[PDB]
């Protein structure tokens, strides 16, 4: 823990600075440091943790996709194979990606989820658990894949169950959870009809609850509703 000597408040402040400077590796390291102080995270701090790691893993996934796309082009008679290089480099990125996912999952397990009693926090962390297992699943193969997929499903499902019981249909965390679980169904679990059903149900139930919201909350909820609708359009 290189961040061990730095004040919790300083780690949080520097995470915000890193965010503004679009230095997401730094931001993630600062928030890891903050998590390791052992205290629960506030709403704002939870967002910083998520933004940081989502951006780091997002970069790695994008790179992995480029390389995978190149790798499969070279692996055929149509195009001269380039040697072991593309595979080696794709595997390097894959291993780094797996390292970041493992780090996040480590944090959630030590001990963010355990200590999260409020629905808002618990659902947030369980959604994250599902997400990072989903990212692991994207690059896994065979039997290892199946267990990872089941771990993602179990985290998402537990999050869903709490969110249905404890949160209104327009709650951004509940919506973001449903959006991501829907993507899981479509892209990971090979269940497009479950993905579509979930996205449509989530959208319709949020729509009927919009009347309760102030204009601020309305804007946040409709944003995610729009992503749900965009995905439905793409999938149907």
């Amino acid at each position: 823990g290189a961040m061990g000597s730095m004040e919790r408040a300083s780690l949080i402040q520097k995470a915000k600075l890193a965010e503004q400077a679009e230095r997401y590796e730094d931001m993630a390291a600062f928030m890891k440091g903050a998590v390791e102080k052992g205290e629960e995270l506030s709403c704002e701090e939870r967002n910083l943790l998520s933004v940081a790691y989502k951006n780091v893993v997002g970069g790695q996934r994008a790179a992995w996709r480029v390389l995978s796309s190149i790798e499969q082009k070279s692996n055929e008679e149509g195009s001269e194979e380039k040697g072991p290089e593309v595979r080696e480099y794709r595997e390097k990125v894959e291993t780094e990606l797996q390292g970041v996912c493992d780090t996040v999952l480590g944090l959630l397990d030590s001990h963010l989820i355990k200590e999260a009693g409020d629905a808002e926090s618990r659902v947030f962390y369980l959604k994250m658990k599902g997400d990072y297992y989903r990212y692991l699943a994207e690059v896994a193969t065979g039997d290892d894949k199946k267990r990872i997929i089941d771990s993602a499903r179990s985290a998402y499902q537990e999050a869903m169950d709490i969110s249905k019981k404890e949160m209104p249909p327009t709650n951004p965390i509940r919506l973001g959870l449903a959006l991501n679980f829907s993507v899981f169904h479509y892209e990971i679990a090979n269940s497009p009809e479950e993905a579509i059903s979930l996205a449509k149900t989530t959208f319709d139930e949020a729509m009927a609850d919009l009347h309760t919201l102030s204009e601020d909350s309305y804007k946040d909820s409709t944003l995610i509703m729009q992503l749900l609708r965009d995905n439905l359009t793409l999938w149907t």
Binding site: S68, Q226, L234
Partner: peptide, 18 residues
């Protein structure tokens, strides 16, 4: 909002394409 939606559509479409 538009950029977020555009970004999302690109990521989701990649899966469908590949």
């Amino acid at each position: 909002r538009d950029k977020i939606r555009l970004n999302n559509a690109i990521w989701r479409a990649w899966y469908i394409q590949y």
